[PDB]
Design an enzyme around this catalytic site. Structure first.
Site, mmCIF file in Angstrom:
data_model
loop_
_atom_site.group_PDB
_atom_site.id
_atom_site.type_symbol
_atom_site.label_atom_id
_atom_site.label_comp_id
_atom_site.label_asym_id
_atom_site.label_seq_id
_atom_site.Cartn_x
_atom_site.Cartn_y
_atom_site.Cartn_z
ATOM 1 N N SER A 74 -25.153 76.908 65.095
ATOM 2 C CA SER A 74 -25.486 76.856 66.514
ATOM 3 C C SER A 74 -25.183 78.181 67.192
ATOM 4 O O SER A 74 -26.061 78.797 67.801
ATOM 5 C CB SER A 74 -24.720 75.724 67.198
ATOM 6 O OG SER A 74 -25.112 75.591 68.552
ATOM 7 N N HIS A 87 -28.025 70.963 72.829
ATOM 8 C CA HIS A 87 -29.330 70.940 72.182
ATOM 9 C C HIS A 87 -30.216 69.817 72.714
ATOM 10 O O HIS A 87 -30.967 69.197 71.959
ATOM 11 C CB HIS A 87 -29.181 70.822 70.666
ATOM 12 C CG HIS A 87 -28.335 71.898 70.061
ATOM 13 N ND1 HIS A 87 -28.553 73.237 70.299
ATOM 14 C CD2 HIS A 87 -27.268 71.832 69.233
ATOM 15 C CE1 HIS A 87 -27.658 73.950 69.640
ATOM 16 N NE2 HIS A 87 -26.866 73.122 68.986
#
Ligand SMILES: Nc1ncnc2c1ncn2[C@@H]1O[C@H](COP(=O)(O)OP(=O)(O)OP(=O)(O)O)[C@@H](O)[C@H]1O
Ligand SMILES: Nc1nc2c(ncn2[C@@H]2O[C@H](COP(=O)(O)OP(=O)(O)O)[C@@H](O)[C@H]2O)c(=O)[nH]1
Ligand SMILES: [Mg+2]
Lengths: 352, 208, 37, 35, 149, 326
Positions: free
Chosen positions: F98, F215
């Site tokens: 990420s 996300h």
């Protein structure tokens, strides 16, 4: 009970007891052998509720040598060798049990192969930055060493100031037990605690304070190779391990007041073919040069008397449950299928 | 097949050949004389004249192999037998005097009785007509129920609910449960016997 | 690998005409290129 | 050709499957049998 | 008529038929490597570098000549032959001799044909094949030398 | 053209791999101390002490974990370079989870430490503010073959509709490995999944310790700040194949990293597809070496679940302790 001998004292076994099983008491099992016995003999001891060892010619010969040992001459190296599963580890155990009864100080290494493979937490020794420590391998051994020799740890007293850390040191004259205790509490100092013990045990034995037996099973590990790696995936040599480097000093015959008894083993070895059993093949040039001069003692398969006695012991324990095992044809088939090999015979009888 | 039709299967029985000629009936004597003129196939790797040979354990071991690995399957079989033996010895040692008479310690007896306690007598065979595969109860042959006991035991031991417990340990536990008429394999036999009692409409079709 | 074996091999290379200097293996491809036609 | 090899340094019967089959079937290729 | 395989030439000569001393023979064997077969005592030099066959024959003869001459030559550098690089095993100035001498001195402080038998046994175990017969000879020699019965 | 097995793939971890004690075993290695000095100069607080010895509650905050992971990943890269120069020399691919992408790009010579760290910081405060805006969370769900994910998200949404809320959010956020996913969105939907996993056929369920639903579109407020932080940055062409998370393919040209790095903030992480793109090959072909440069060993377990044969040649760089004192 033709397969048993009432003589439970190993100091009086002779050629007339060959092939007969003598009993080791539970107290002797928990004191003398916290770690010695093979893994598959321990299951037998648990299943039969008794530890019975056969008296065999290798052990008798090695006991005859140790009874007539001169404690003024340098320590003699005895090396047990033979084909796989012929009973050399249990001969070593017979001799260790003999020596523990006469108040020898027993330094028993159950398997030197475990110190050269499959170590998860390897450290850099502060005493010597070029060596590596094995705290779990050393602390595990120290507990059982203390268990076996708990009596002497107070009598034997150190002869130098050992400095564990700026805050902690062992003063001259303190009992060896404290050193052992320091290895058990803080594992960071376990490996350095083993070496100190050896250094003391070699020295004081020379003065004559006690008789020392150095019993190392799987001794061919010391001068071989390892499967331990650095962080850069490079190999580590056996002499780079502090635990292995300190144990080689005790194989040299630069001391008196004791004997060195050793057993080879291809089982658990590294980089050795399955059929290698002779001293030089397993030791290597370095190992043979280190041990030379030494007395090699051969361990072989059961002879007919020994084989019949082993099956009679198993029958007396009701361990052969197949209906045909008591019969002559069953014994002939067992003899062929094991070829009188103790380990194969025991494994076959395990599932019969 | 590489064997011609005239080749006959060998007879490995050893005590068969030791019968005195006197006992031999005329039919058996004729059979023996006939056997001399025939070709006999090479004995396959496996069965032997050994006194410890057990065809049921051999068949169970063959049913456990995966990908032709017979060494591993036989290793598992012997490990299971030894585990059953050691468990029975542990239970015998800890038992009082009058319970030691009713504790079995022969693993072969336990294995055979465990498989016998799981054999089903009756099963269902589908039959085709009308687009409907008709499920009729059928008395299972002996060979069929012998196969089914072994298959149910093995499938029970291969279940994924048993995580990281090794096959010998699972198999010895299941065998000792089935020895005492307990466990999931006995329930699998019962849930076939009741589910064939629930379909006794077509119970007399005798031409499956 | 001892030194004795090392440049004993390096002398043998000089006698039989191989590449005396150990040129690893990636840069020996010139030898194979010019060996053939 | 040779120049190309240098700068690089600085860094069965030859017939079609058909025509082969016809000759091999007619026995015109010496040594070629059918299995 | 051309064939590329006709240029190959194979020279075969037994080293026992050449005038080589111990060092010369050792050097020649180590130089040649696998071309020398110990079972047959034959050196087999195969030449195919040159296009023609007479050229390969001349090259094989030249190779044999230079190999012989460089086998009979001792460089300054030769003197450093390590123990591991030996072919046989010399007992004098060996670790076995050092250890047994130390042990005997210690025994005398605590207080020969035997040493000859001990060194024979060690040399056998180090050079020949290791059987239980050799191991038992070594055992008997060590027992007699260490006063073990 | 070199046989695979002498090549190397560097995997960079993401949020959730923080631990008290990162850096120990890396400090004495070459060139790490000035990376942490630059971290002090850019961040405004001493990252070094917080990573070495911290309450773990200060370290678990979003604003602090991400810079810690970024700097630790780069320090581990330096350690690996010191121990094994050939591994860094023979590198074929790189991928981060990420935030590791920001590390991976920096490792690929596409960004510089100062600008990359600034971007990571701004991303961190922006995400923290977005999480504070609305309650939300992330839930790791391991499914069985009969599990249906889009379906379960749907009922999780009608639950919040029944309760009453504008456009409830519950959607699969992280593709990790077969049948294991991370759902993200409002906490009520995740409670619904936790309680009726039985009808959702979910074998295991575990709430992730995170501030908010990353996300997803809930992080839309954080897209615009980060974009600004990236306008000034001049992204070059990666030297190695750096794999993206929005679509799980290699970054091709410098002119698309700018917007892909912002789309990642509000798009699911395609980790399973990235592993497939990096490792998938015919049975029998050898796999490249894999090195997890950074804290933790989570990517190792994910790779084991995804591709066992690739996992056979996997190793992790120890960032907590060192065998030899350099
Ligand atoms: N003296 C003995 N008394 C009783 N059983 C014995 C004896 N020697 C061997 N056995 C049987 O043989 C088995 C193998 O013996 P042991 O482990 O000592 O062999 P080993 O030759 O040292 O083996 P390895 O080469 O594997 O180290 C023992 O477990 C026991 O079953
Ligand atoms: N921590 C600590 N360990 C010691 C000390 N002395 C000896 N040891 C350990 O005990 C072992 C004894 O080995 P030694 O006879 O001294 O041989 P050395 O390694 O060359 O010094 C050493 O290898 C050390 O591991 C000491 O004063 N402090
Ligand atoms: Mg042994």
């Amino acid at each position: 009970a033709i397969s048993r001998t009432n003589e439970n004292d190993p100091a009086k076994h002779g050629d007339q007891h060959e092939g007969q099983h003598y009993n080791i008491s539970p107290q002797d099992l928990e004191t003398v052998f916290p770690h010695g016995l093979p893994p598959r003999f321990v299951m037998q001891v648990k299943t039969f509720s008794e530890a019975c060892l056969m008296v065999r010619k290798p052990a008798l010969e090695l006991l005859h040598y140790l009874k007539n040992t001169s404690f003024a001459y340098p320590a003699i190296r005895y090396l047990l060798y033979g084909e796989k599963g012929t009973g050399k580890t249990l001969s070593l155990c017979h001799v260790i049990h003999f020596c523990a009864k006469q108040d020898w100080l027993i330094l028993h290494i159950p398997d030197a192969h475990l110190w050269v493979k499959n170590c998860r937490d390897l450290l850099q020794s502060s005493y010597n930055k070029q060596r590596f420590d094995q705290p779990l391998e050393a602390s595990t051994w120290l507990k059982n060493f203390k268990t076996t020799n708990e009596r002497f740890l107070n009598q034997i007293k150190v002869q130098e100031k050992y400095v564990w850390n700026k805050r902690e040191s062992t003063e001259k004259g303190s009992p060896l037990g404290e050193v052992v205790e320091q290895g058990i509490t803080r594992v960071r100092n376990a490996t350095d605690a083993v070496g100190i013990v050896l250094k003391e045990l070699k020295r004081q034995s020379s003065l004559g304070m006690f008789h020392l037996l150095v019993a190392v099973d799987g001794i061919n590990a010391l001068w071989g190779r390892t499967t331990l790696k650095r962080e850069d995936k490079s190999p580590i040599a056996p002499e780079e391990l502090a635990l292995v480097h300190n144990l080689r000093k005790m194989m040299k015959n630069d001391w008196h007041g004791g004997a060195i008894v050793s057993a080879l083993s291809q089982t658990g070895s590294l980089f050795k073919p399955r059929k290698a059993y002779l001293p030089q093949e397993l030791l290597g040039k370095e190992g043979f040069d280190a041990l030379d001069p030494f007395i090699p003692i051969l361990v072989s398969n059961y002879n007919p008397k020994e084989f019949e006695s082993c099956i009679q012991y198993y029958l007396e324990n009701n361990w052969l449950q197949h209906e045909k095992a008591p019969t002559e044809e069953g014994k002939k088939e067992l003899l062929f299928l094991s070829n009188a090999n103790p380990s194969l015979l025991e494994r076959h009888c395990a599932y019969l | 097949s590489r064997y011609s039709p005239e080749f006959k299967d060998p007879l490995i029985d050893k005590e068969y050949y030791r019968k005195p000629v006197e006992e031999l009936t005329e039919e058996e004597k004729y059979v023996r004389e006939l056997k001399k003129t025939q070709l006999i196939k090479a004995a396959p790797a496996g069965k032997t004249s050994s006194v410890f040979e057990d065809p049921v354990i051999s068949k169970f071991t063959n049913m456990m192999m995966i990908g032709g690995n017979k060494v591993l399957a036989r290793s598992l079989m012997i490990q299971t037998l030894e585990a059953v033996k050691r468990k029975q010895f542990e239970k015998y040692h800890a038992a009082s005097a009058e319970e030691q008479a009713t504790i079995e310690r022969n693993p072969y007896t336990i294995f055979h009785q465990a498989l016998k306690n799981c054999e089903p007598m009756i099963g269902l065979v589908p039959i085709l007509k009308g687009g409907r595969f008709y499920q009729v109860p059928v008395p299972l042959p002996d060979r069929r129920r012998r196969f089914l006991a072994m298959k149910w035991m093995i499938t029970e031991c291969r279940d994924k609910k048993h995580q990281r417990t090794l096959m010998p340990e699972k198999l010895s536990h299941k065998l000792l449960e089935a020895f005492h008429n307990q466990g999931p394999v006995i329930k699998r036999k019962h849930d076939l016997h009741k589910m064939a009692e629930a379909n006794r409409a077509l119970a007399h079709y005798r031409w499956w | 690998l001892s030194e004795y074996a090392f440049r004993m091999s390096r002398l043998s290379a000089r006698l039989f005409g191989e590449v005396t200097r150990p040129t690893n293996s990636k840069s020996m491809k010139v030898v194979k290129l010019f060996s053939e036609l | 050709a040779d120049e190309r090899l240098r700068i690089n340094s600085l860094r069965r019967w030859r017939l079609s499957r058909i025509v082969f089959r016809h000759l091999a079937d007619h026995g015109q290729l010496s040594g070629i049998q059918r299995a | 008529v051309r064939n590329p395989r006709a240029r190959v030439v194979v020279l075969r000569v037994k080293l026992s038929s050449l005038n080589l001393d111990d060092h010369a023979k050792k050097k020649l064997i180590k130089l040649v490597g696998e071309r020398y077969c110990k079972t047959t005592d034959v050196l087999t030099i195969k030449t195919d570098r040159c296009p023609l066959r007479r050229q390969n024959y001349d090259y094989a003869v030249y190779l044999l000549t230079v190999l012989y001459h460089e086998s009979w030559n001792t460089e300054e550098w030769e003197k450093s032959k390590t123990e591991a690089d030996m072919e046989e095993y010399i007992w004098e100035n060996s670790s076995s001799e050092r250890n047994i001498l130390e042990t005997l001195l210690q025994m005398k402080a605590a207080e020969t044909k035997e040493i000859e038998e001990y060194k024979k046994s060690v040399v056998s175990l180090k050079n020949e094949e290791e059987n239980e017969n050799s191991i038992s000879q070594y055992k008997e020699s060590v027992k007699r030398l260490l006063n073990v019965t | 053209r070199r046989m695979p097995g002498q090549c190397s793939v560097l995997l960079f971890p993401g949020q959730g791999s923080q631990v008290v004690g990162m850096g120990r075993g890396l400090l004495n290695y070459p060139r790490v101390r000035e990376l942490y000095a630059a971290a002090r100069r850019v961040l405004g607080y001493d990252l070094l002490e917080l990573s070495l010895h911290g309450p773990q509650e200060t370290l678990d905050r979003t604003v602090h974990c991400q810079p810690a992971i970024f700097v630790a990943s780069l320090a581990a890269v330096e350690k690996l370079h010191h121990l094994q120069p050939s591994v860094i020399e023979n590198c074929v691919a790189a991928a981060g989870f990420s935030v590791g992408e920001f590390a991976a790009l920096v490792f690929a010579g596409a960004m510089e430490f100062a600008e990359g760290l600034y971007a990571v910081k701004i991303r961190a405060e922006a995400m923290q503010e977005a999480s504070e805006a609305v309650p939300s969370g992330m839930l790791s769900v391991l499914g069985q073959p009969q599990s249906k994910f889009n379906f379960a998200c749907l009922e999780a949404r009608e639950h919040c509709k029944s309760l009453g809320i504008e456009n409830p959010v519950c959607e699969v956020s992280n593709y990790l490995f077969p049948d294991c996913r991370v759902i993200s969105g409002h906490q009520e939907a995740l409670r619904f999944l936790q309680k009726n996993s039985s009808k959702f056929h979910f074998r295991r369920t575990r709430m992730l310790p995170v501030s908010g639903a990353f996300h997803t579109r809930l992080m839309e407020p954080a897209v615009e700040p980060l974009t600004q932080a990236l306008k000034a940055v001049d992204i070059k062409k990666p030297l190695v194949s750096v794999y993206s998370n929005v679509h799980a393919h290699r970054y091709r040209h410098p002119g698309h990293i700018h917007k892909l790095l912002a789309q990642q903030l509000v798009s699911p992480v395609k980790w399973e597809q990235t592993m497939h793109a990096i490792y998938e090959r015919k049975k029998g072909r050898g796999f490249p070496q894999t090195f997890e440069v950074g804290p933790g060993r989570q990517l190792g377990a994910i790779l084991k679940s995804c591709n066992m044969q690739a996992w056979k040649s996997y190793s992790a760089v120890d960032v907590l302790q060192t065998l030899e004192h350099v």
